[PDB]
């Protein structure tokens, strides 16, 4: 017997927002860095960590030129930055929505070790969820983010880690669809270790298949969802060298073997790659001579912003040039969504 | 850790045969009717059941006009009919392969009731499988068929039935890929009962998702496989009336929500429909304004042949006209594969 | 490959505490009633809801006669009542530990509806868990409680509800064993509805088997755990009448068919029964002529205390007599643990 | 909703036969050796392989002294030996039933490699099962045997192997209970390799828990079943030395952590051990100071018979002395069932 999770209207608005996210040429910036993370990056530039610093850095990120307007469809934010206002007086979700962007928010509470395993973890943030996301829906957020972590090793990932991860991810996605906010499924696989393309392709295949089995168990609506996997990439200590074309071919085979086409879009991680290399890989991924029944776009935290970071210097008088560098990468990533990029 | 089931060459030949099955405009005839089934159909025409009768009826089926040659890509056979020869002297697999067809064979051993359930069944035929299919591979068969049965009721299908069915189906498919013969996954849902389109859509969604989870557990190669589901159709005693367009829309939604696009083709059942109605439904299914990343074709036992049955009369002097009627339906089904049919 | 969740010492102390809980003749009082619950019960006696009222009521509950000392081995508490002190000045966990009791605490955050289902729920309280239970371990709590809810209906429980419930319950139990606090598994089945003994026996069998499969997936240590199921009882609107002996026989069959004997003890719910009836049922359950390889004891929230509630009147001058009534039931339940009770 | 697999009468007769199998002091001989196996053992004694040889060897095995009559409760047979008759004229099942024994039969069809894995296998023999076991029930067989194989290695057993193995084992057990013949669950783990007691204990724990989850899925009746696991034993190339007491303690912990007590009996494998060592281990297993809620007995193919083999010489004039040696081991194993054996 069936009792529908969603009315047809709710599925319609989730479909509208999901289509608005991965419109062709439009991509996702991840401004969701937590205080420890952004503190590490601001120690890397060598300045102090204050709220005004984070606010001014996101004043750099969000108030850029109008050339980003057919580039950025949505941006993920931290909980803190929702309630900060710009120097014009406008709150940041209005600044995003004015140039056509959609507000996203990182909602998880970090990582917890799994007992009985070897360094595996699961994610935190299940409690108070409906009230929190309802508040964020009142505050204009329309999609959200949850990040689960898996790593390659001797015998890892175990089936326990994959099973629990997909299960709580489905729990997340159900709660997101209950009030009308789009979830993005992000099964992040660690690129750490030394492993070829083949073992990595096998592992993301199994974990993604387990993910979609779990989602189909929980009566998810697939068009009201997004997918945020990693590009399959060999390990940091892997001595074997590969072309971009082989990585892209393994990526589209690992994607095509499990993902149902009723998912509206697929967006990739940075995954610790270079600023130019991730763009090259995405442009190759779009250039594969196969059939892709979804949107293939970019969701880059560091890869969009680390150049603007390195150009900022922590000093205000640079920002525009820094903003310009930000714009540069965005335009490249825009063409990397459409398969027309060349370096 | 990974140990590959197949060498790249084996995956290549399975890909070649799978592409040759669902080439655009090419479809599957099911001449695999068992002795009780064909005895019932020949009691329906009112003649006796002999081996020469079955042989002559398949002389009608296989030796038709050359107009079927860009229509029938493959045909499923019984074990008996592999070892029968035509009046010209040629064995029937050569007669199929001469006009470009591919030999298929029904290999299961029937249905067994499940204990503890309410009229559910599972399928037989797992033993001696590698030797039997290796013999069939020597005898020219390149793809095979297995039929599992599910029904809608008060609380049925239970999860036990779906789980066991998908599990043994995956066992089948693995054994088929071990020697180089293509399996077709056929999760047949009974149209018996009274139930709307929505409950049926829900049930085929769940059972197909469980199927593909099971297949991904068993390291199946997806491009070396086919899918044989039912069109979602309301029950025989269901009083609610529906357009063909709603059935086709529910079909492509139930298909698009679970099937990975690395499956090469999808072919439908007759499912007890009319001769014209199944063609109308398939032509509508191809005419849906969505994105389908596979081949959508027809696999009709009765629906291709019952007209030729009704035109045969059991008497030899009719056959050509009977064969002509067979050709008629095939041509219609051919256009029904391409979306260009009109009645 | 194996990486042990627990060192042998940790398993040893969990075994010590688990043995100390279900020592023969020792049972569990549930003083864990939330503010809405105890507000409903204090509206039932018709007084106001203050913190001093709740404190004075638990002054009734915990400061009773020394005759309860070989009766109550442990007591479950609310988070609020851990930090309240008695009129002598001693904090309540010291008052429990002085007479030999062990401190327990309810840690979940309530119930959340499941989308796509018909009135099913799952439980809240997974976040901040390690820090909270570590704080409770510093504050003297040694075991904890988590309550998940299932109900009988037309097609409910679905497999989704059972699967998610057992999964998050295992997540709970793992986190409890990580720092050294004993979890009790409580799969509460609703007695609401109208259903015979047989359907109920079937449902608790399936959900308990799924529970222990989930626990064995998560590398739980079974001797460091407890089990808190319901006695199988027909529904409130079930017209069929049954003896206590049939209920007890169905209970020990439903218990013996799934529970591994390396669980240290099993303690039952009140389940909305009468004050005398639950004691009669437990005494019959211990009197079954089968083989029980665990402790079978009582964990009664209302059934131990509702008489003392009805004798209290909200007025201080009664308390001792009220306390006496409390003692009465405890002694009965003590003999009901040992099979020597008669009414 | 519930539809019972068995009527209460059927459960009663399965309970009677299961109680008659593992009555205290009564054990199981495995005379089920296939033609290749018994051909290898008769090549080891250095004679020819004929049907009269196998018949005469089982004339040694079954027609022994009356001292075995409170020792052997049941004996497993091959399909061939059911239809062979003794020199007195009596058929062998009557010879077993005359001295109080119960007829058992090995029904599987051997092992098949699993694709995609590293040397894993699954078992054959699912087809024609109801008719075959119904014939065996007419021919006096009351219980049956099925042998599935798992091995320890680098990353093996995979979850696929365990899952498929438990699934088809449950399918077997259901079919056995459908007509009234008792199944014994035999999850044989290979002792080959080099591995400590701990990894082995972990692996049998997981596979046995998965087994009982699968059995509870398929509505098995637990009192109408038996369990045939291995004693946990370190590998052949494992250099670590262990006492018998540690092996027995790990065995009863691995048993007590998953087996429900509604299983009537547990009987062990030989597992390639010595003739004396397996008896010492079983006598220690019964001598553990824990609580065992079942029968713990011996099911020894080679360990009961290899002495009589080595005393036979292939020549008829020895047999009685050879039979005497057989009796010797049986008596020892009888005391090894009761914990009163000493070497």
Numbering used by the authors:
A (entry chain D), B (entry chain C), C (entry chain B), D (entry chain A): 2 to 344
Source paper text:
To test this, a cryo-EM data set for aldolase was collected at 200 keV using beam-image shift and analyzed. This analysis shows that the instrument beam tilt and particle motion initially limited the resolution to 4.9 Å. After particle polishing and iterative rounds of aberration correction in RELION, a 2.8 Å resolution structure could be obtained. This analysis demonstrates that software correction of microscope aberrations can provide a significant improvement in resolution at 200 keV.
Using this data set, we were able to determine a 4.9 Å resolution structure of aldolase without aberration corrections. Using these selected particle coordinates, particles were re-extracted at the full pixel size (0.91 Å per pixel) and subjected to 3D refinement in RELION. The refined structure reached a resolution of only 4.9 Å [Figs. 2(e) and 2(f)], which is significantly less than the published resolution of ∼3 Å. Unlike this previous study, our aldolase structure collected using beam-image shift at 200 keV was limited in resolution owing to aberrations to 4.9 Å resolution.
